[PDB]
Amino acid sequence: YIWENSTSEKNILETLLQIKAAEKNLELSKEELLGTKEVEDYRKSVVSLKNEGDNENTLSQYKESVKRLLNLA
Amino acid sequence: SRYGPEYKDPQIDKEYYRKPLAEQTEEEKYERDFKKTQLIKAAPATKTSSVFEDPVISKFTNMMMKGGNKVLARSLMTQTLEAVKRKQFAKYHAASAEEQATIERNPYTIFHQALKNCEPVIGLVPILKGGHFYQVPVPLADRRRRFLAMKWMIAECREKKHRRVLMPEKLSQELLEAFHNQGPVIKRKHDMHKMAEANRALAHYRWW
Amino acid sequence: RAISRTSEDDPAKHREQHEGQHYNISLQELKTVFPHGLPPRFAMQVKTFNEACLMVRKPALELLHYLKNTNFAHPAVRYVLYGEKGTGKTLSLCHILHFCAKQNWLILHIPDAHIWVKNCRDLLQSNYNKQRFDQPLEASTWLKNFKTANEHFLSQIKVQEKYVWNKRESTEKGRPLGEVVEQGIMRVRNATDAVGIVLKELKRQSSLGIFHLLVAVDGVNALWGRTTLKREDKSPIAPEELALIHNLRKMVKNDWQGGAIVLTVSQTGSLFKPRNAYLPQELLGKEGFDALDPFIPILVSNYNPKEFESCIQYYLENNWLQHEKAHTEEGKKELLFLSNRNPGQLERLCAYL
Amino acid sequence: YYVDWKMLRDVKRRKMAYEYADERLRINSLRKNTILPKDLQEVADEEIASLPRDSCPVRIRNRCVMTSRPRGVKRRWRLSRIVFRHLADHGQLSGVQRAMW
RNA sequence: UUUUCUACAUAAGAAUAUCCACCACACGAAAGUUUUUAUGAAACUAAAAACCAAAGGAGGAUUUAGCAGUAAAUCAAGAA
Numbered sequence: 001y002i003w004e005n006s007t008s009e010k011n012i013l014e015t016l017l018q019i020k021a022a023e024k025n026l027e028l029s030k031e032e033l034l035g036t037k038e039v040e041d042y043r044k045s046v047v048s049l050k051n052e053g054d055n056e057n058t059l060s061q062y063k064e065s066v067k068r069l070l071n072l073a
Numbered sequence: 074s075r076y077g078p079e080y081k082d083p084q085i086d087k088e089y090y091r092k093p094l095a096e097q098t099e100e101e102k103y104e105r106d107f108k109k110t111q112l113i114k115a116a117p118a119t120k121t122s123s124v125f126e127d128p129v130i131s132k133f134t135n136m137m138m139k140g141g142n143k144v145l146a147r148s149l150m151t152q153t154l155e156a157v158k159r160k161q162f163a164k165y166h167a168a169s170a171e172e173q174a175t176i177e178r179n180p181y182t183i184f185h186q187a188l189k190n191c192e193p194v195i196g197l198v199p200i201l202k203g204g205h206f207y208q209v210p211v212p213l214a215d216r217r218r219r220f221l222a223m224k225w226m227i228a229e230c231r232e233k234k235h236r237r238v239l240m241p242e243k244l245s246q247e248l249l250e251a252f253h254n255q256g257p258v259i260k261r262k263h264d265m266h267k268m269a270e271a272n273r274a275l276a277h278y279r280w281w
Numbered sequence: 282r283a284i285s286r287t288s289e290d291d292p293a294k295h296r297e298q299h300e301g302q303h304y305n306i307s308l309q310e311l312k313t314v315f316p317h318g319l320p321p322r323f324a325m326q327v328k329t330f331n332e333a334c335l336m337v338r339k340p341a342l343e344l345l346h347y348l349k350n351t352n353f354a355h356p357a358v359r360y361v362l363y364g365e366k367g368t369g370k371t372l373s374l375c376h377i378l379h380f381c382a383k384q385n386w387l388i389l390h391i392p393d394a395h396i397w398v399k400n401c402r403d404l405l406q407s408n409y410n411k412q413r414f415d416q417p418l419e420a421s422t423w424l425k426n427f428k429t430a431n432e433h434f435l436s437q438i439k440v441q442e443k444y445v446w447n448k449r450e451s452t453e454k455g456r457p458l459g460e461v462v463e464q465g466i467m468r469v470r471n472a473t474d475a476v477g478i479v480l481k482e483l484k485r486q487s488s489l490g491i492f493h494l495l496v497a498v499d500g501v502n503a504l505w506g507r508t509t510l511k512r513e514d515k516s517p518i519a520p521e522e523l524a525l526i527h528n529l530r531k532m533v534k535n536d537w538q539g540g541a542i543v544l545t546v547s548q549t550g551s552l553f554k555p556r557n558a559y560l561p562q563e564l565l566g567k568e569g570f571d572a573l574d575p576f577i578p579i580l581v582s583n584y585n586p587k588e589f590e591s592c593i594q595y596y597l598e599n600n601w602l603q604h605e606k607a608h609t610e611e612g613k614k615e616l617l618f619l620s621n622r623n624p625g626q627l628e629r630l631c632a633y634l
Numbered sequence: 635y636y637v638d639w640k641m642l643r644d645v646k647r648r649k650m651a652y653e654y655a656d657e658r659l660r661i662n663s664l665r666k667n668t669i670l671p672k673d674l675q676e677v678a679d680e681e682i683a684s685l686p687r688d689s690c691p692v693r694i695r696n697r698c699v700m701t702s703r704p705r706g707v708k709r710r711w712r713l714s715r716i717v718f719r720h721l722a723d724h725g726q727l728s729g730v731q732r733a734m735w
Numbered sequence: 736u737u738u739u740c741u742a743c744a745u746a747a748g749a750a751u752a753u754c755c756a757c758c759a760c761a762c763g764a765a766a767g768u769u770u771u772u773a774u775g776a777a778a779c780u781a782a783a784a785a786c787c788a789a790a791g792g793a794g795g796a797u798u799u800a801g802c803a804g805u806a807a808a809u810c811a812a813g814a815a
């Protein structure tokens with residue numbers, strides 16, 4: 001699984017711009033959103049999840065990435 | 074039989090071993106069981122030391138089995154006990170104060186009591202004498218009476234039930250019917266008594 | 282000595298320390314909150330007991346905490362429940378469903394998405410799109426259940442579009458949505474189209490502040506897997522051919538605002554999936570998992586020792602375990618070993634001992 | 635002299651099949667392929683059927699090499715069932731013993 | 736009906752000889768018709784599919800087999 005030019009990448013762009021639009025933040029750039037540390041954590045989790053496979057720790061890592069990316073704690 | 078004459082039937086009841094110090098004669102029995110170095114058969118797959126089993130259930134479960142489907146036979150016996158429990162629970166709810174503490178909600182109590190009412194007291198065996206057969210009554214043994222009650226239960230609910238009605242629910246109905254001494258099985262038991270009483274003067278033919 | 286039903290019944294104030302406690306819910310409450318298919322094992326249990334009780338599980342508390350912090354300005358948040366068979370995933374969803382009904386939310390509850398995939402007696406071709414099929418029997422039953430789920434919103438919602446059923450009857454803008462669903466119930470031929478109209482209208486209007494939309498789909502893995510249903514040539518059809526799945530598919534893609542969807546991937550009703558597989562990825566497959574990220578994979582576990590005692594003591598209060606020796610600790614040990622402290626296996630055992 | 639006239643006929647049949655084995659294989663290849671034109675395949679059928687009758691693999695019959703019993707012959711030893719027991723019961727066949735289990 | 740169908744190892748969904756204002760339907764063709772595939776010089780042999788849905792609703796006098804991993808149910812390979 002490759003992160004670049006993937007359907008999961010398209011979902012992330014739509015998911016982040018909606019939050020930025022909801023928060024009334026006018027800064028919008030592909031480099032800005034894709035250069036975030038949280039997205040980097042998301043990239044590592046998804047690539048590991050689809051390649052290594054499902055695991056108790058792998059899903060736990062996936063939970064943390066989504067919670068921090070969606071501002072849910 | 075792969076077991077020789079020396080092998081014996083194992084003892085499964087755990088309580089028989091945990092409290093032996095309260096008796097003396099029984100202590101001599103099992104201390105010589107291994108002191109004679111008598112071989113013991115392997116534990117049968119059906120019987121187990123679980124406190125939730127019952128010997129009368131296992132025999133009834135085996136007879137319901139057709140072919141080799143023990144899973145299906147056990148599944149049917151599980152639903153039938155559940156089906157009896159559901160009906161008695163519903164009847165308990167819709168009852169008056171005096172009626173509430175009359176209904177029994179224990180399927181095992183119902184199952185044990187039902188079969189003890191379907192057992193004939195005196196059977197018939199044909200005897201040939203003078204070129205003719207006379208139905209002569211005999212005092213059937215306890216094992217035969219217990220087995221005969223189970224066969225009548227299975228025979229009735231397999232033949233004269235409707236095609237739509239399932240087996241577990243049809244057998245549940247007859248257990249309640251036999252619990253109240255009004256089921257067709259009870260009628261069949263009385264019919265065998267009718268023939269035995271009619272031929273009460275032919276009991277002299279038998280020689281045992 | 283265990284505590285079983287002492288906890289006061291309120292979905293809003295359920296806290297972590299109330300773990301393993303049963304709270305009573307009124308029978309009439311089930312009628313107005315669960316008009317869809319309650320799980321048959323639990324539906325049979327409440328009928329006999331005549332008392333509806335549900336135990337507070339950790340996944341229920343974890344999902345409750347996230348719901349209280351939901352920001353309706355943000356887009357929809359996807360929650361999925363996964364676990365081995367018989368762990369009470371559906372009842373955990375029903376615990377969430379009752380909480381949102383208590384808070385007066387808009388409910389879109391699917392009992393089992395597999396029913397809309399397998400064993401359909403009628404397969405009618407669609408009219409809006411020629412290359413699609415309809416399932417009037419399944420769609421009509423859902424509309425009747427959805428009609429009785431809520432009534433205040435069905436009249437408060439105003440439809441603003443131009444909808445034509447046939448050349449003789451049509452529905453114009455301004456009519457309440459309650460009249461539309463009632464038209465679909467009476468006209469079973471267009472009931473499937475009514476379901477899509479109901480789904481799309483709620484999604485478009487969900488951006489407003491008048492809605493607190495909750496969509497509960499059980500068996501989400503059936504929205505992408507292969508379908509048993511065939512056609513006149515006896516050739517399998519893709520899951521996208523079905524109109525009900527195709528429109529419901531648009532209800533899980535995260536694009537609308539002011540809503541939250543709780544999902545659950547199951548195995549009992551799944552098609553072409555092995556018994557042992559329970560993890561989200563293999564159940565959804567490549568396509569199913571692809572169109573669901575991101576989400577929060579909440580895991581449903583078996584009973585803990587504290588919960589196991591509470592469930593056993595609950596049955597003893599209702600006089601369910603009628604065996605003579607079932608009241609002793611030895612019987613409790615056997616129940617723990619045989620059932621592997623699993624709620625699904627425990628219910629089957631207690632039904633006949 | 636072979637043990638019977640039937641055995642002699644089989645030897646002629648096997649000999650004829652060997653001579654026309656390659657020629658039959660080449661022609662039979664055309665028939666069993668659907669990419670060639672149907673006109674050529676019809677001509678091939680005429681030629682393959684014009685070959686002598688005895689030159690057919692299916693007409694070969696497996697008998698016993700000792701008594702020429704047309705059936706009841708084990709393919710491994712090429713012997714009739716009666717002759718095989720006669721040799722095996724005397725211990726004249728290596729590794730063959732009465733089965734007991 | 737301890738049944739049939741599908742998914743699948745054995746916790747599921749659906750069908751179920753009847754109702755009828757019309758319809759249409761359960762179990763059961765292995766048979767038969769047609770088409771195709773396999774072997775072969777030759778198909779008359781075997782197998783698959785489509786269509787087709789008949790007798791059969793637990794069998795008269797009488798009779799066969801089995802004492803435990805046996806009867807019975809179910810699956811697989813080999814000999815030529």
Ligand SMILES: Nc1ncnc2c1ncn2[C@@H]1O[C@H](COP(=O)(O)OP(=O)(O)OP(=O)(O)O)[C@@H](O)[C@H]1O
Nearest residue numbers: 322323336366367368369370371372547549624628
């Ligand atoms: N929270 C709970 N409180 C009380 N009983 C419960 C609870 N969860 C599960 N049970 C019991 O366990 C049974 C199994 O529940 P349920 O049908 O929801 O399981 P599931 O894990 O979703 O199953 P499946 O694998 O079919 O999707 C219920 O019918 C009920 O008897």
Ligand SMILES: Nc1nc2c(ncn2[C@@H]2O[C@H](COP(=O)(O)OP(=O)(O)O)[C@@H](O)[C@H]2O)c(=O)[nH]1
Nearest residue numbers: 408409443444445446471474477478481524528
């Ligand atoms: N009968 C009927 N149904 C309609 C009409 N317009 C929309 N629908 C239904 O509304 C649903 C939503 O369709 P939609 O998502 O817009 O179609 P798409 O744009 O091709 O994806 C469809 O399932 C239709 O059945 C109409 O004029 N008549």
Ligand SMILES: [Mg+2]
Nearest residue numbers: 369370371547
């Ligand atoms: Mg479930």
Ligand SMILES: [Mg+2]
Nearest residue numbers: 636637638639
């Ligand atoms: Mg001679």
Ligand SMILES: [Mg+2]
Nearest residue numbers: 665666775778
């Ligand atoms: Mg040919």
Ligand SMILES: [Mg+2]
Nearest residue numbers: 692693694695
């Ligand atoms: Mg030959």
Ligand SMILES: [Mg+2]
Nearest residue numbers: 746747748749
């Ligand atoms: Mg079933």
Ligand SMILES: [Mg+2]
Nearest residue numbers: 761762763788
């Ligand atoms: Mg049929």
Ligand SMILES: [Mg+2]
Nearest residue numbers: 762763764788
């Ligand atoms: Mg058939």
Ligand SMILES: [Mg+2]
Nearest residue numbers: 764765766767
């Ligand atoms: Mg045929």
